[PDB]
Design a protein around this ligand. Structure first.
Ligand code: ADP
Ligand code: ADP
Ligand code: ADP
Ligand code: ADP
Ligand code: MG
Ligand code: MG
Ligand code: MG
Ligand code: MG
Ligand code: MG
Lengths: 371, 13, 371, 371, 371, 371, 13, 13, 13, 13
């Protein structure tokens, strides 16, 4: 009776059998529907496509994400995503495979309710639990005192945990990360005259970001370097073989995690948001939090990000205090890996919510650990 | 780091 | 058949095998229970913690003392304290180890009754005695004519003893000492803007008190010195590495032993309470009392306290009379050390109360030497 | 020679001529500076704005409060606030108008010193006094035996007064009130998915709080009512005409005065803080304190607050004892009104501190009645 | 030209015009001065208060008695007491009203001298006498052969009189009575855990004593009754409405008149002091003394006291001899009533000391009947 | 076979080996038993103490004299006194050491019988005699015609002897001396306000008497001197270092030997009692009695006493007649010294009463010379 | 018992 | 309640 | 000062 | 004055 573990990212869906070391489905959180007219009756095969097939098709298709900032805004396409996840990818009959699901903290409670309602009524899943991504990140990181920094495609959030107790007031969240960084990179690349406009070109700019972008340790020094020298410049080849050349823009894009002023946001950067979240914590907690600052992958894959963060936090926090940042190469998968651990634990299984309980406690039981 | 080791660690804890 | 000796302090519990030179358990008189929400199911291991473990945990925990002013106000937590003391600390099976227990004078008789009832009925202890802390302090101080000044975490009391006879009318008691001095130190440090609020921060302020505080010989001269010069100022580093700087506040805190007006109490200081207790004694006794003024530790660990006390008593008492103050460095342990002596004495053993006697005299036999 | 009376609130500035029945200036304690780039050279008229002008501008501006919890953290902006208060609002030349100023109790003494130094040296004010807001609240409430509960934008504090004598040890203070309640309301409204983030949106949530929030008489009954029925739900219209709908959240916000656990604070609610402050008072005082429990306005404007407080105190305090709560509709102005009375009193005027004395006693004379 | 009669009790001041049936002033012998800081300038009206006003104020005030054990130890406050007695209470101009004053026997002669010096020089009283309280008690009791037992707030004394001749050697005195009984009641109530500490709480314990206490006829039988049954228990309500419950303590307090060992005094009880005083008397006198044992009020108001005394004296004295104890309900006032009689007597008036005589005999004439 | 000589004084016990020049035991006629509670089980060593040890202990102890006015009122404690005298002081086994014992004249015959019965039956003394203290005083004074004046702690008595013949009708006795003088000194010192009450304080007042008191030659002149000048005043330091100052009281105390009216006795003073005793003597005897007036120590140690006595007797007796008073510095010991002489005399030994004679004459033989 | 009566009693005596 | 009345009240006290 | 010495002292006393 | 002398005196007498 292998449990299922599904992490529904704002940009990537990660679904895997409990106790496995890696997800099996990793396809994009994407649905596409043709903008163009079909004429070859044998070829207009589908009105809609799921993210891997939809990515190849994207040149004809319009692409939409069903999640915005950890919120689900198109439940029909999200049901499409889960249906394809369970039947097409994992080849598994969910009637027998109880499921763990993930959400960002401080999400609307309606989102969790509606997701649970779909899971029981549509898929007939026999048992379910919903888990908080920071806790999964700590299970993946092998420790029980941590502060977790997350940045998927959508939300960025900071959660402190101590001896397995969570500090709900110390949570801090920014709706920023990958998508906004991609759009800002589109504008900056527009500064050089590479007009990218379509959602397909948005996906191309996402790939450009994921390869070329690196995080400055001293943004002003990098700006002076790119102004004085071409040595930072890189070339890349678009799918049609056109060549694009990029300079300061590379580091200027991820730098807008630290300086959301470039988006026009006033909220302080991820470093200051982390520091303030630590300050919310009771004074003794802070020392152990500085020793255990864990990164939840996604955008934190960038080169240099951990060094820049350590420099910033050491500047913000008092001296004479060990500040240490833990970011394994699996950090992106680490949310799923945490779910894979949690579902396996013999202690955990009584945490399941059973279809009986959903048929008796109404929804409200899903709120029990809403955090 | 492997998932099995972490499971055995927390089940031991 | 080694007897047990347990001193239940308002702030520290001290339990040791009779004839040993020091206590083995010295852990804080503290129980803590998590205020914060548990989420890591493998980690919310206990609903309650005992003072040493509870101190490390305190950053999450709320801490409560089960004793206030030598009175026991949460018997459930007090049973937790004794259970952990006997099994976890002393590794001893109390069925075979008769026990000596301590109390402040002028305590409610119900407290002694309830403690004895717990000791016999819950732990099945085969023999017990309850002893008065001043007498133990005199055994620790190697003399049989003394006046004892005590100040634990809770009570302050003065007891005169002469040739081993106790003067029940000359007893004087103040509910003051460590805890009130700590709270006043919290307020004074608030005067500089270091907002300490939590019970964990109360424990931090207790540590600040225990290190930094010193007792003025001339309070007005010290106030003028701190006003005119920084030379009295000290820095200290909080657990999060923040630096705190403190000046006049250091001596101003223990000075509020001598001037309880700063708490708003009207009762005269420890010096005048000692002098008045001596005046209660019959005239001949006084000369030998002035020669034998013994300090029972706890707060009397402060620097300068004995010199200030000698200055005050010499000002209060008539001239041409030797005033001498005895305060060994063991003065804090000295109550336990006295118990360790008393339990060993061959003459003492018939003082034991046996479960038979408790099953026949009812409680009342515990009152025999209630004093 | 009409004296000036200025109350510098953590959130609202209240300035009025002595003996007037109401303040004339009531503008917000706010300075704003443009985050966005100016381009219309004729329109970027000012680099900084004062709270009334800054509120309209706030949509472009970033807003900062210069006071946090009765502490002044940006003296430059505070000088801007006072400069605009005297010249722009009151149209008065402070060379001729001696001034009364207000502060929370247990504030850092440096704050009072620096404020006085600014008042004399920068504004050339010829005479000054600093007064304690609870005493002003009692003058406004026409009585001389009272316990005062205060909650401005920043501090909450309890002060007992009896026959005009103040009990410095019975003072109790919480850094809570308006700002923390507003932030918690932002988080709770986030539970429904209304993402408010900017300081402008903080001001919108403050207005939402001030209109919609009401205090439960039985929090659990209200929670059950909101769960079982929509009848508690309200709608509100944001500045852009978007509609927001709110239910249980309304009473859940002010309930976190009584249960600071929802902020994660362990300090007992305003009811238990009042009761404990009464317990600090000597036994005879208590009866008259229960008869005279006075509310100092600000957040205590909420509907139901006085009834809930009376219910709680009657539950906490012994039976057969009149518990009575005095909260006029002017309770918010009542601190200023008390200052307006006090400055007018012929008996008071010798309490003034004159520029000569400040030039001779140094600062320290401002401490004379620091309380 | 109505003479004045003033009785200055250790605890109550009693002043009345000669020939009146009762005193007019009965206010407490109390001066109080604020321990707490004044802040409401309109309300710190007085630095000192007289016993009736001082009692209501006592919750803020510290209270001091100016008399200890019939000795005057604070002449400044005693001048305050007399000033308020003459002007505020009796509304009388002492220039016209010659005065009778009372004292305990065996008082220091300096006390009488200083009192007389104050009366003439400060108040300009034109004539004075000092009278001995036992003689006044016999005039109040309508007889000229008596033994008088007295117990005010301070002194207890026994004086035998026969045919109006006084036996100076048979006088016996104990410094005991009300105040020591009150303090002992504070300690005993501490045995139950009712911590009373302040002088205000001392006054509360005085009221508790005056209402609840009753005198045992068989102390050991009463102790067995209170041990075996709750039927002796009473409840009382403190000024703050808290309820206090008291059992054996009630009779145990006045029993410490008979057994001063509970105070630690070795002097025999009032019964044995009476018997020994009778034994000092010449043999024939004794028979008439046993017939005429008169009680001078104050503490002798207790229930049962006369029956217990009769039991004790009948046990001590030889059988076949009538032992009879006279204790009218006016016994407390009876000292003043005796003064009111004595001053009225036409035979008495030549006993007056005139300001001329005080200006010529020095003080010493006040000693003429010092007794 | 050294005889024993024991003088049992009302206040001091004097026991010595016959032919020695001085007593060896001089300890007080005192037994003490703790009034206070014992708590140090190792320290409550004895339930009772003998006068030297009892004096140091007296601060805890109650002290009792076993003799009142040459009468033995606690035979158990008197047996304690003798047991300690023989074993602890003299280190002598009374089985071998026949004993001489002393008594006042006109004592109850039962007292002598009971003392003898104890001496033979309890101590197994082999021979005994009882001797009359005046005769011993004459042996000490080396003459066989004398009148003896005695004043120990208890009795005062006058006995005339002529050529070794005693005049039983001329005996005169007063129960006065040391103890009554001490109590009167307590009252007089109370006139200044030095409250002495305890038996320990009685012993302190005894020491005050023994040092400070002196006898007036003209009581009225001394009273005028002390009234007009401080030059008679003396200071003394109590055991606690408190200073006491004394004036007229010094001579006023011993003056109450001559004027027992101050005690309330009507019996004429020692001078008139001596004169009347001389008048009882046959006319020729008187001339030789005036030549040989011998003082038996104790209270007659006072300064001035012999001069005052000579002045009084010369005023009372006819002129032209030598009046001469013999009072060696050994006068206190002189009773014991007389016993030491008498027991040694070879002529005396047949005066012994042997245990055989006590076993044959019953008691009555002790009466043979009862006088 | 009244004060006047006691006065008249002692003045008579 | 008016400010003038309260002033006159405290100045009277 | 050691506990054994004090015990022996009081047991001797 | 010594005791021996007084003894010898009275034994002589
Ligand atoms: N160096 C120090 N200076 C002043 N006080 C101290 C110091 N070390 C410990 N204390 C105080 O000693 C007290 C504990 O003493 P203790 O006699 O064990 O009290 P209790 O017996 O009531 O627990 C606490 O109030 C603690 O703050
Ligand atoms: N109708 C209302 N209901 C609840 N709170 C209110 C209302 N009106 C104003 N407030 C609160 O009053 C506070 C300001 O009170 P005030 O005593 O002026 O504080 P300060 O003196 O620190 O500026 C703000 O927190 C504001 O939100
Ligand atoms: N009902 C009562 N029972 C016992 N004692 C009482 C009672 N009422 C008053 N007293 C005592 O009477 C004493 C006052 O008596 P009073 O003769 O006026 O003394 P003084 O003359 O020295 O002031 C106080 O000790 C008071 O406690
Ligand atoms: N210096 C002194 N002046 C006066 N009296 C003294 C002095 N020394 C001792 N006495 C008195 O001597 C008395 C004891 O004398 P003593 O003959 O031994 O009496 P007793 O034989 O009855 O014990 C006591 O009353 C003591 O106070
Ligand atoms: Mg993610
Ligand atoms: Mg202690
Ligand atoms: Mg306010
Ligand atoms: Mg009286
Ligand atoms: Mg004698």
């Amino acid at each position: 009776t292998t449990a299922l573990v599904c992490d529904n990212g704002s940009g990537l869906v990660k679904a895997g059998f409990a106790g496995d070391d890696a997800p099996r489905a990793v396809f994009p959180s994407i649905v596409g529907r043709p903008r163009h007219q079909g004429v070859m009756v044998g070829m207009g095969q589908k009105d809609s496509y799921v993210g891997d097939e939809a990515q190849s098709k994207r040149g004809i298709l319009t692409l939409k994400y069903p999640i915005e900032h950890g919120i689900i805004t198109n439940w029909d396409d999200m049901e499409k995503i889960w249906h394809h996840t369970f039947y097409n990818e994992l080849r598994v009959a969910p009637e027998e495979h109880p499921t763990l699901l993930t959400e960002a903290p401080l999400n609307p409670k309606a989102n969790r309710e509606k997701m649970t309602q779909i899971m029981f009524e549509t898929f007939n899943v026999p048992a379910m639990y919903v888990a908080i991504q920071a806790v999964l990140s700590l299970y993946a990181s092998g420790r029980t005192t941590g502060i977790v920094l997350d940045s998927g495609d959508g939300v960025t959030h900071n959660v402190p945990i101590y001896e397995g107790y969570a500090l709900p007031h110390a949570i801090m969240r920014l709706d920023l990360a990958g998508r906004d960084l991609t759009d800002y990179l589109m504008k900056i690349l527009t500064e050089r005259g590479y007009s990218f406009v379509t959602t397909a070109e948005r996906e191309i700019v996402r790939d450009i970001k994921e390869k070329l972008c690196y995080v400055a340790l001293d943004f002003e020094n990098e700006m002076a370097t790119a102004a004085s020298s071409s040595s930072l410049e890189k070339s890349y080849e678009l799918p049609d073989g056109q060549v694009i050349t990029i300079g300061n823009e590379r580091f200027r894009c991820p730098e807008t995690l630290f300086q959301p002023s470039f988006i026009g946001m006033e909220s302080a950067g991820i470093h200051e948001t982390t520091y303030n979240s630590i300050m919310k914590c009771d004074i003794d907690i802070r020392k152990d939090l500085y020793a255990n600052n864990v990164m939840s992958g996604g955008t934190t894959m960038y080169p240099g990000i951990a060094d820049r963060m350590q420099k910033e936090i050491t500047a913000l926090a008092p001296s004479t205090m060990k500040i240490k940042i833990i970011a394994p190469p699996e950090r992106k998968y680490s949310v799923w890996i945490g779910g894979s651990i949690l579902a396996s634990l013999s202690t955990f299984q009584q945490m399941w919510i059973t279809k009986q309980e959903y048929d008796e406690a109404g929804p409200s039981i899903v709120h029990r650990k809403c955090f | 780091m492997g998932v099995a080791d972490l499971i055995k660690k927390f089940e031991s804890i």
